[PDB]
PDB file of C-alpha atoms (C1' of nucleotides) and ligand atoms in Angstrom:
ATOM      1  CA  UNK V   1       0.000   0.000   0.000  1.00  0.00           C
ATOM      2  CA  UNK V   2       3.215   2.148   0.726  1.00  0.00           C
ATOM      3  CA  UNK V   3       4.180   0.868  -3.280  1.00  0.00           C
ATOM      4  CA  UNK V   4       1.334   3.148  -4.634  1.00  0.00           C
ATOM      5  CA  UNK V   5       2.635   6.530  -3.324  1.00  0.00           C
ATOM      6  CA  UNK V   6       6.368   5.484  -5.056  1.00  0.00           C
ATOM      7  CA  UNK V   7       4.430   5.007  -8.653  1.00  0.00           C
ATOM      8  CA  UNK V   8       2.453   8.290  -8.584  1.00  0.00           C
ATOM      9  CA  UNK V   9       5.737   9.767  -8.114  1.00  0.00           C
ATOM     10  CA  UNK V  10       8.134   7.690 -10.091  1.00  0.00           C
ATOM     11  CA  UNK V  11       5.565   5.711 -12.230  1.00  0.00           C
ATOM     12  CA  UNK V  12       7.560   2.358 -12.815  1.00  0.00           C
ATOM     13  CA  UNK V  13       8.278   1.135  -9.579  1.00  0.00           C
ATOM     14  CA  UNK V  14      10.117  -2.670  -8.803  1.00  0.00           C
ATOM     15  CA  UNK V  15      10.284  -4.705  -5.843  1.00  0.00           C
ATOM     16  CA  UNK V  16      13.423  -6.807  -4.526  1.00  0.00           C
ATOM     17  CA  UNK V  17      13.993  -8.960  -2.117  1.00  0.00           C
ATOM     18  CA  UNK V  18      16.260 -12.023  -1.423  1.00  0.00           C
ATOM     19  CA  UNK V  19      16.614 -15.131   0.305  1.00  0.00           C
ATOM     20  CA  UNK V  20      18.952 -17.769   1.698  1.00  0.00           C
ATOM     21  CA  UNK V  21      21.575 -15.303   3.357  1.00  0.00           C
ATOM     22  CA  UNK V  22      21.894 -18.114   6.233  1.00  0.00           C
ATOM     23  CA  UNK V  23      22.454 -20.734   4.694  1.00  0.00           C
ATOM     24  CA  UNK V  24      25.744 -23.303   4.717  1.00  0.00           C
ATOM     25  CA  UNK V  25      25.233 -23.663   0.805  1.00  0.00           C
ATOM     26  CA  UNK V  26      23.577 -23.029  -2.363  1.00  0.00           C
ATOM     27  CA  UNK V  27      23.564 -19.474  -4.348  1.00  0.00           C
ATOM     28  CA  UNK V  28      21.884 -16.615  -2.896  1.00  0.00           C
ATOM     29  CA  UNK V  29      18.866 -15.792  -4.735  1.00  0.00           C
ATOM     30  CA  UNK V  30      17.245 -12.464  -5.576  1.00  0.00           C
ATOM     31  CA  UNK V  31      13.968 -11.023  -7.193  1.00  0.00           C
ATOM     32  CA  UNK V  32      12.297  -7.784  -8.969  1.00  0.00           C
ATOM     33  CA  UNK V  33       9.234  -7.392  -9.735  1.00  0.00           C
ATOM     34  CA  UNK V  34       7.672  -4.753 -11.426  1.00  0.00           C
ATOM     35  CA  UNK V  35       3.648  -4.879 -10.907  1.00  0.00           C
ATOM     36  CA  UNK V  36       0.036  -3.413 -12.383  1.00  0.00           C
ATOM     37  CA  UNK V  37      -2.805  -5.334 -11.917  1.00  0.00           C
ATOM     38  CA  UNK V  38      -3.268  -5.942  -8.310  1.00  0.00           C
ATOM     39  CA  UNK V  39      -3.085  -8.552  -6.514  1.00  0.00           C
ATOM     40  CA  UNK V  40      -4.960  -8.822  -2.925  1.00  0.00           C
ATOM     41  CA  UNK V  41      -3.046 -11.244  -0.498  1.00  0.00           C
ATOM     42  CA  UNK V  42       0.176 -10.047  -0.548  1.00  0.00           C
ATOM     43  CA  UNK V  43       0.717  -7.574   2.217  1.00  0.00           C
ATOM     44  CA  UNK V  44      -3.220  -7.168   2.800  1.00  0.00           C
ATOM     45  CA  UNK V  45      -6.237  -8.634   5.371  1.00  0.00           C
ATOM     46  CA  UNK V  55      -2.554 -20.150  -4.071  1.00  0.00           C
ATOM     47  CA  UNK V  56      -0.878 -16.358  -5.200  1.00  0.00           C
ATOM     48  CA  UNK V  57       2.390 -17.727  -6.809  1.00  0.00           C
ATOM     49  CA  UNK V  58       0.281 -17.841 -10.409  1.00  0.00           C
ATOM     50  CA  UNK V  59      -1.237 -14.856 -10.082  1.00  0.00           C
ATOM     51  CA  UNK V  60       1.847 -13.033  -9.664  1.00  0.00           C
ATOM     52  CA  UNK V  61       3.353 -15.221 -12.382  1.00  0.00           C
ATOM     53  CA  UNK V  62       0.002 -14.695 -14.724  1.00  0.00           C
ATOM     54  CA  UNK V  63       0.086 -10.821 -13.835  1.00  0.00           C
ATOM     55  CA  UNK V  64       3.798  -9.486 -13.294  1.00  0.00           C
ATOM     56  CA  UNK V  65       7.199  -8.656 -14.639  1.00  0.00           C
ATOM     57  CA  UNK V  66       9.775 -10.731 -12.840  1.00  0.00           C
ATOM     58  CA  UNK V  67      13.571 -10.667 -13.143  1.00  0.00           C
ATOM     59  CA  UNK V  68      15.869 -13.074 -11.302  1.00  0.00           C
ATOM     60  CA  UNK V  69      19.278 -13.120 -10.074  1.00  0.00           C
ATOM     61  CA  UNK V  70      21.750 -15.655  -8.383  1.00  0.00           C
ATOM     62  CA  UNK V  71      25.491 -14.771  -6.758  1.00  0.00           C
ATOM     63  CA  UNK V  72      27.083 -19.123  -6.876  1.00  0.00           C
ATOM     64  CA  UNK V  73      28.609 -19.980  -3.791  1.00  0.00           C
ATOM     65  CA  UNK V  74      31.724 -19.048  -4.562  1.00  0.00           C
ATOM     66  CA  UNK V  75      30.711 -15.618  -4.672  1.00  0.00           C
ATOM     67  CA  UNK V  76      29.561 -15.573  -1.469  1.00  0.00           C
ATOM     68  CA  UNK V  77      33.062 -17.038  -0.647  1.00  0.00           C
ATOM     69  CA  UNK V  78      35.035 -14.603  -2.373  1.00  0.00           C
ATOM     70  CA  UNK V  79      33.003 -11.155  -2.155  1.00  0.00           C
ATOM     71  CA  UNK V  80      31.463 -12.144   1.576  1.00  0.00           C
ATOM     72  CA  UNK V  81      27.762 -12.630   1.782  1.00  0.00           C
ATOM     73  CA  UNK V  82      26.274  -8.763   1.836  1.00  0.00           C
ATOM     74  CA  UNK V  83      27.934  -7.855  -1.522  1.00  0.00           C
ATOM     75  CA  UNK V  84      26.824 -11.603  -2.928  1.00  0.00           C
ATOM     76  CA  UNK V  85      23.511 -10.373  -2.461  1.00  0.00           C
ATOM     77  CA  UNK V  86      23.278  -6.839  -4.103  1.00  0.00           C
ATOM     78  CA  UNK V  87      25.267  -8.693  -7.460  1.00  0.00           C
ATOM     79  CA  UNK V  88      22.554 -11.072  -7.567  1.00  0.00           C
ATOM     80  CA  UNK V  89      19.976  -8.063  -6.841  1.00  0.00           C
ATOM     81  CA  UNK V  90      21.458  -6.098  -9.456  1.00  0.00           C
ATOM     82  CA  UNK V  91      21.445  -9.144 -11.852  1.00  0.00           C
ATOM     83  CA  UNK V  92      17.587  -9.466 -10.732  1.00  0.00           C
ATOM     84  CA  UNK V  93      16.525  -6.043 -12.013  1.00  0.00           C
ATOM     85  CA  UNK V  94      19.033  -6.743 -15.028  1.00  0.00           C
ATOM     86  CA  UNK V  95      17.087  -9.802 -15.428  1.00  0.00           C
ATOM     87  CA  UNK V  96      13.640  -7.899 -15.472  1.00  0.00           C
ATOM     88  CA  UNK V  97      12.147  -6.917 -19.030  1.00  0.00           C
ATOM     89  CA  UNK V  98      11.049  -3.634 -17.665  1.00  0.00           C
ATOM     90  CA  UNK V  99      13.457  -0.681 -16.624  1.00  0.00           C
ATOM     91  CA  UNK V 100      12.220   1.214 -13.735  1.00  0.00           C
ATOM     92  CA  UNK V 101      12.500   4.474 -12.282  1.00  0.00           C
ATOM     93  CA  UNK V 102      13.199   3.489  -8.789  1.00  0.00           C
ATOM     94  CA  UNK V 103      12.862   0.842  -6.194  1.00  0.00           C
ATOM     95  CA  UNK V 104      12.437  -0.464  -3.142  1.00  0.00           C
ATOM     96  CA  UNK V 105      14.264  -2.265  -0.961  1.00  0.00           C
ATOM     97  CA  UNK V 106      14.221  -5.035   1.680  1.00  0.00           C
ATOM     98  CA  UNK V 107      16.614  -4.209   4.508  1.00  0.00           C
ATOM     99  CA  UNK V 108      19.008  -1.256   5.041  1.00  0.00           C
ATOM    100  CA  UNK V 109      22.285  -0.248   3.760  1.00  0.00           C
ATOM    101  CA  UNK V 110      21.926  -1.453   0.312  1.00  0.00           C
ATOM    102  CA  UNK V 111      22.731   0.990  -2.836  1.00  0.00           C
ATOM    103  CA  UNK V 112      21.697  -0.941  -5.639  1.00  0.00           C
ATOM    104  CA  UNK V 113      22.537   0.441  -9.678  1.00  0.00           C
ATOM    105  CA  UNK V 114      18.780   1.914 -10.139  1.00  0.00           C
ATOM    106  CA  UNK V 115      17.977   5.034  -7.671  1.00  0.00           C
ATOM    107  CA  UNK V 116      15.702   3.306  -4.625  1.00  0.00           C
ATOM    108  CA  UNK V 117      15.000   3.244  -0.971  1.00  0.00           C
ATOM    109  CA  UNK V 118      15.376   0.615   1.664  1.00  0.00           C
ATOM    110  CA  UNK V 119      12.686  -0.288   3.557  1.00  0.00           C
ATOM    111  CA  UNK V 120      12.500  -2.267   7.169  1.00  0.00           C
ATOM    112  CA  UNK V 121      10.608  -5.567   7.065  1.00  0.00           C
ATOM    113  CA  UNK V 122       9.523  -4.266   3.882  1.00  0.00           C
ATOM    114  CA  UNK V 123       8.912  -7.591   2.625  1.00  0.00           C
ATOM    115  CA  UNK V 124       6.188  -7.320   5.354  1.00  0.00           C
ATOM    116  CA  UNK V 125       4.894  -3.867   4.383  1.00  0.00           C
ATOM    117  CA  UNK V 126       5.059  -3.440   0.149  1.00  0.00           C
ATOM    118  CA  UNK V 127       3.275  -5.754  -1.911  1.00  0.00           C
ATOM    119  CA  UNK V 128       5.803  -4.933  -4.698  1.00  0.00           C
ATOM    120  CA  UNK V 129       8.608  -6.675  -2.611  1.00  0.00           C
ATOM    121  CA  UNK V 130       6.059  -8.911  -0.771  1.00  0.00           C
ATOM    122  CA  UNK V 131       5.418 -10.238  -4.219  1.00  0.00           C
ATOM    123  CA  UNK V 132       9.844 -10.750  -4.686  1.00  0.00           C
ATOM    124  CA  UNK V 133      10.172 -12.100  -1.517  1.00  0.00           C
ATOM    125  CA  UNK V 134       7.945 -15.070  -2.552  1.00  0.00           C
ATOM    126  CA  UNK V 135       9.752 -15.571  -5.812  1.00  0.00           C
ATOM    127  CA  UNK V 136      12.717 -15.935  -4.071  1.00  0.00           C
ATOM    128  CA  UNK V 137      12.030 -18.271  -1.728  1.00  0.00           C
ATOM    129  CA  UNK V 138       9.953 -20.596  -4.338  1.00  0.00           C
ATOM    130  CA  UNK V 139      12.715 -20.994  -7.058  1.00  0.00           C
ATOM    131  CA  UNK V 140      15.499 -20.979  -4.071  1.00  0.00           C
ATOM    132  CA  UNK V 141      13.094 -23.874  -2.550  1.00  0.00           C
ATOM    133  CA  UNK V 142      12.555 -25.229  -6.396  1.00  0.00           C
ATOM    134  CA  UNK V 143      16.454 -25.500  -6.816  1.00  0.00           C
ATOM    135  CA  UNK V 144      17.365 -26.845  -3.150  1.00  0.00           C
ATOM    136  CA  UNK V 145      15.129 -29.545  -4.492  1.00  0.00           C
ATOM    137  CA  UNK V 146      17.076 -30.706  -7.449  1.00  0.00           C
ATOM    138  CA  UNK V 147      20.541 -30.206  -5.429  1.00  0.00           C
ATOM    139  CA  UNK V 148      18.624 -32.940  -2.974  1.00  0.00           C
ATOM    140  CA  UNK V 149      18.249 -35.384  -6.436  1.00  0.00           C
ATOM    141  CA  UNK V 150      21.773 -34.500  -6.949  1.00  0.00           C
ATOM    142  CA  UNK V 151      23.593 -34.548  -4.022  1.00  0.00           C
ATOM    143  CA  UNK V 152      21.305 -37.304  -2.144  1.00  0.00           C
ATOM    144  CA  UNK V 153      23.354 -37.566   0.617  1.00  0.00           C
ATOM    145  CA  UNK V 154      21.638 -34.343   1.987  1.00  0.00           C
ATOM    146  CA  UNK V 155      18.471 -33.619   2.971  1.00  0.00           C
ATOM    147  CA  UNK V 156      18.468 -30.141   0.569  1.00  0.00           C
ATOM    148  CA  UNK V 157      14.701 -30.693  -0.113  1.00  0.00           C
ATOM    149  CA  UNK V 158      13.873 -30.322   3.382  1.00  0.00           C
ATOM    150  CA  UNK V 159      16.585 -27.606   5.692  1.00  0.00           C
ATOM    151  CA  UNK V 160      17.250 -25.881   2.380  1.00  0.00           C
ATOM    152  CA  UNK V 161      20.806 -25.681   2.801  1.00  0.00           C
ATOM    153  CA  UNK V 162      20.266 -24.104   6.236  1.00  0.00           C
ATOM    154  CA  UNK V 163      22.308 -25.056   9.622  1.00  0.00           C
ATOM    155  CA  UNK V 164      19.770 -27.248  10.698  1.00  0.00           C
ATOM    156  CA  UNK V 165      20.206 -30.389  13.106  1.00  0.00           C
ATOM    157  CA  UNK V 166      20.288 -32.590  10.267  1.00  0.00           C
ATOM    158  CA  UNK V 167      22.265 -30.399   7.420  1.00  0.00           C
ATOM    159  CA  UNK V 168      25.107 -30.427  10.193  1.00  0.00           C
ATOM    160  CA  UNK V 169      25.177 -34.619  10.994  1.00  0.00           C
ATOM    161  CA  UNK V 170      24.831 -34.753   7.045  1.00  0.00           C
ATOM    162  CA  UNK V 171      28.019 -32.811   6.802  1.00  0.00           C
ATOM    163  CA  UNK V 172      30.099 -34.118   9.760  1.00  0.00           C
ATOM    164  CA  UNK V 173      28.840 -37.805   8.810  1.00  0.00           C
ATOM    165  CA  UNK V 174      29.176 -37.158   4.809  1.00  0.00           C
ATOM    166  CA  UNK V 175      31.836 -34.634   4.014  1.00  0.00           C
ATOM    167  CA  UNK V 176      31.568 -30.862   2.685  1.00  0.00           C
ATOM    168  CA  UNK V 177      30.499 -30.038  -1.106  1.00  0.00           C
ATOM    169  CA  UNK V 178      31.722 -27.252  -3.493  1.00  0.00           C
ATOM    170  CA  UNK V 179      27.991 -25.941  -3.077  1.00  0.00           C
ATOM    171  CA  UNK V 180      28.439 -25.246   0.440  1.00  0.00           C
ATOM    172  CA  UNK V 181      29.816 -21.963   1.710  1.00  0.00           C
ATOM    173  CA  UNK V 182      32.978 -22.298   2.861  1.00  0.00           C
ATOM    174  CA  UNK V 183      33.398 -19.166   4.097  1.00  0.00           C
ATOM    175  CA  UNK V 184      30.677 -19.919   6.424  1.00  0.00           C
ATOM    176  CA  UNK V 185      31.674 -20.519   9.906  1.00  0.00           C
ATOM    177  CA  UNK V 186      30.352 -24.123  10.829  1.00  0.00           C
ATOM    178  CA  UNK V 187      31.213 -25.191   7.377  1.00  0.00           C
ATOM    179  CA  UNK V 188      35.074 -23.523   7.673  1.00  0.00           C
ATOM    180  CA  UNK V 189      35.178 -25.190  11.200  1.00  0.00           C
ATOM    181  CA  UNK V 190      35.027 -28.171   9.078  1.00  0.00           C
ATOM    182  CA  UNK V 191      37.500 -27.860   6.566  1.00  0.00           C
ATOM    183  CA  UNK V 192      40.724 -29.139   6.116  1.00  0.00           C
ATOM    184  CA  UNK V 193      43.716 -27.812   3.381  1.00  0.00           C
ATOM    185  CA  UNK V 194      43.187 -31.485   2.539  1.00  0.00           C
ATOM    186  CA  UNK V 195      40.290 -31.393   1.409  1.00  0.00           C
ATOM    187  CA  UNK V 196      40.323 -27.802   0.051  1.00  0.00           C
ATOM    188  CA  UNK V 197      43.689 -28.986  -2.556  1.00  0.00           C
ATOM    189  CA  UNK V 198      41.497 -32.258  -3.383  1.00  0.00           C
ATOM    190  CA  UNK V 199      38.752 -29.407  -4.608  1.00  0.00           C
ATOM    191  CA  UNK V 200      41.234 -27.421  -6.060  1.00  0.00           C
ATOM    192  CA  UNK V 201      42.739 -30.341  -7.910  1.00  0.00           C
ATOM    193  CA  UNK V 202      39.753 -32.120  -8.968  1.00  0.00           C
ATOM    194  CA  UNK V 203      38.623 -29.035 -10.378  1.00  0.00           C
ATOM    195  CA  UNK V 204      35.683 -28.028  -8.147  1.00  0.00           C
ATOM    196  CA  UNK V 205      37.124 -24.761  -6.824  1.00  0.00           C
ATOM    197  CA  UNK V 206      38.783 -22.313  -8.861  1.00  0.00           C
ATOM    198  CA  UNK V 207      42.306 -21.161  -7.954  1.00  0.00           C
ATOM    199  CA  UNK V 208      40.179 -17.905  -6.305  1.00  0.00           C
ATOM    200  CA  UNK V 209      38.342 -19.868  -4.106  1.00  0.00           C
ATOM    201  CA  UNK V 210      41.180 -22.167  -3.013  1.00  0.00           C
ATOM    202  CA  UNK V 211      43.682 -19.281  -1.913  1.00  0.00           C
ATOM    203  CA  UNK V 212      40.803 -17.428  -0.478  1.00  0.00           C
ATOM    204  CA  UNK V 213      39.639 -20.224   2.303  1.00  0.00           C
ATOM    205  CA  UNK V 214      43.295 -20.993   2.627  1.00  0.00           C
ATOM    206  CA  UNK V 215      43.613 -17.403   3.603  1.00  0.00           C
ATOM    207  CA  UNK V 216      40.722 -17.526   5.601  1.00  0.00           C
ATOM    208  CA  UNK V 217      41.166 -21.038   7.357  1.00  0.00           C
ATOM    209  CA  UNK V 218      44.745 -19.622   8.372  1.00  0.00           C
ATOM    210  CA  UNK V 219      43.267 -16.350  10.028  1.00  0.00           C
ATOM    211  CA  UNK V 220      40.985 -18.480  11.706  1.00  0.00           C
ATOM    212  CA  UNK V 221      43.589 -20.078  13.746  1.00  0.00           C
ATOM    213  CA  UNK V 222      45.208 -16.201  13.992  1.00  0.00           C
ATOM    214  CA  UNK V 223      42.548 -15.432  16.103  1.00  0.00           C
ATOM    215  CA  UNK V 224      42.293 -18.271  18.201  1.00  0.00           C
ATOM    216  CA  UNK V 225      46.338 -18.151  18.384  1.00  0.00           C
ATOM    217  CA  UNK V 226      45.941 -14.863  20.228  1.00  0.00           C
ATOM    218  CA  UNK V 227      43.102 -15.610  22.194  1.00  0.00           C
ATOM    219  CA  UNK V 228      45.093 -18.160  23.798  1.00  0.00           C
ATOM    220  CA  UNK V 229      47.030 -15.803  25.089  1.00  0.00           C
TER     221      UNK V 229
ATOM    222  C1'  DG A   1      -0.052 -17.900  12.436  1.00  0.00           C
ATOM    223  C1'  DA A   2       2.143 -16.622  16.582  1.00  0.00           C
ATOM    224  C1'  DA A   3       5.804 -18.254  19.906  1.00  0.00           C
ATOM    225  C1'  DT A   4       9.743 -20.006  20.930  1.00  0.00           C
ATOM    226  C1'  DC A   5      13.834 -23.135  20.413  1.00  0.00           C
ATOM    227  C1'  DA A   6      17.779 -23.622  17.197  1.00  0.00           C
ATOM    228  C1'  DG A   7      21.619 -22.097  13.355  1.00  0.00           C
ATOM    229  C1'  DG A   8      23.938 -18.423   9.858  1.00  0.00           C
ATOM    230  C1'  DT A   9      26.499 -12.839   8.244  1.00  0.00           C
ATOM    231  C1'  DG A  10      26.875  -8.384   7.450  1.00  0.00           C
ATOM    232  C1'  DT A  11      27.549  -2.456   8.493  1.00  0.00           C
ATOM    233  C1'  DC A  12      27.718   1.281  12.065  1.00  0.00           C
TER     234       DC A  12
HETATM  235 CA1   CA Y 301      12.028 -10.193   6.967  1.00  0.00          CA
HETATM  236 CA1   CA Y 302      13.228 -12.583   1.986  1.00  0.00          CA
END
DNA sequence: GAATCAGGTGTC
C-alpha cells in the first residue's frame, strides 16, 4: 500500500527482495518485480500464479563461490542487481528489503519491507519458491543431503549430514560451521579435482589460516 | 499464524 505513493511519483516502480543469506550452501537468490494489476493477499487482510500470470519478474543468483570470495552482503546486491538486469522492464526506482543497500537503479530501503510493500512482498515469494525449487534438485543431486527439506540451512540434520558425509563445493565455505570443518586437505582435493577455482582455493586458505590467527591470540 | 527453540552474516 506504501508501493502506490512510489508510482504516482516515479511511475515504474520494482520490488526486490532475497533469500537464503543463512544458509551453509547453495547461491543466494534475488527477485524484482515490477507490478500493475493488483493482486490482494500479498501484504493485505494459491498467489504464486497470479503473480506469475500478472507481473514482470527478473531473477538473479550470486554461486557460492561468490559468497566465498566477495562475503555474503555484496553476494547479495550482485545477484539483486542481476535481478533487475534480469527484469524486461526498466524502472524508475525501487524499493528495498533491509538497510544499507545501494543498488545500480535510484531506490530506498525499507524495514521488514517484505512485510509492508506488496511490490517486494510479491519478490520475496519468488525468491524463496525458485530458491526452494532449486534446493530440491541439489537434494536429487547430491542425495546424501536432505536439501529438499533444511534448504541448505544449519539445521540439526544439514550439520550430521556434513560431519557424517563430508563438505560439497555448493556449500559456503566461508561460512563458519562449514570452515570449522574444513581441512587444506580437502580444500587442494577441490582445487585439484577441479571443483574450486584457484580464487576460491587461496581465499579459504587465507581464511582457514586467520581463523587459527585469532584463536592463536586468544590463547594468550 | 504466533511463539519459541535452534543455526547463519553483514555495516555502524
Ligand atoms: Ca524479513
Ligand atoms: Ca526474503
Amino acid at each position: 500500500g506504501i508501493d502506490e505513493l512510489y508510482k504516482k511519483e516515479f511511475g515504474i516502480v520494482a520490488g526486490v527482495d532475497e533469500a537464503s543469506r543463512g544458509c551453509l550452501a547453495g547461491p543466494v537468490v534475488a527477485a524484482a518485480v515490477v507490478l500493475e494489476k493488483e493482486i490482494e493477499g500479498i501484504n493485505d487482510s494459491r498467489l504464486l500464479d497470479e503473480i506469475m500470470e500478472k507481473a514482470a519478474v527478473g531473477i538473479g543468483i550470486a554461486s557460492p563461490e561468490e559468497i566465498d570470495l566477495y562475503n555474503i552482503f555484496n553476494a547479495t546486491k550482485l545477484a539483486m542487481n542481476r535481478a533487475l538486469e534480469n527484469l524486461s522492464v526498466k524502472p524508475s526506482f525501487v524499493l528495498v528489503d533491509g538497510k544499507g543497500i545501494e543498488l545500480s537503479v535510484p531506490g530506498t530501503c525499507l524495514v521488514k519491507g517484505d512485510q509492508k510493500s506488496k511490490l517486494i512482498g510479491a519478490a520475496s515469494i519468488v525468491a524463496k519458491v525458485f530458491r526452494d525449487r532449486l534446493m530440491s534438485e541439489f537434494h536429487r543431486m547430491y542425495p546424501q543431503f536432505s536439501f529438499h527439506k533444511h534448504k541448505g540451512y544449519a539445521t540439526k540434520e544439514h550439520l550430521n549430514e556434513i560431519r557424517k558425509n563430508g563438505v560439497l563445493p555448493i556449500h559456503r565455505l566461508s561460512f563458519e560451521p562449514v570452515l570449522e570443518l574444513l581441512t587444506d586437505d580437502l580444500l587442494r582435493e577441490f582445487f585439484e579435482k577441479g571443483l574450486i577455482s584457484e580464487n576460491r582455493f587461496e581465499r579459504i586458505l587465507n581464511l582457514l589460516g586467520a581463523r587459527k590467527s585469532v584463536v592463536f591470540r586468544k590463547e594468550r
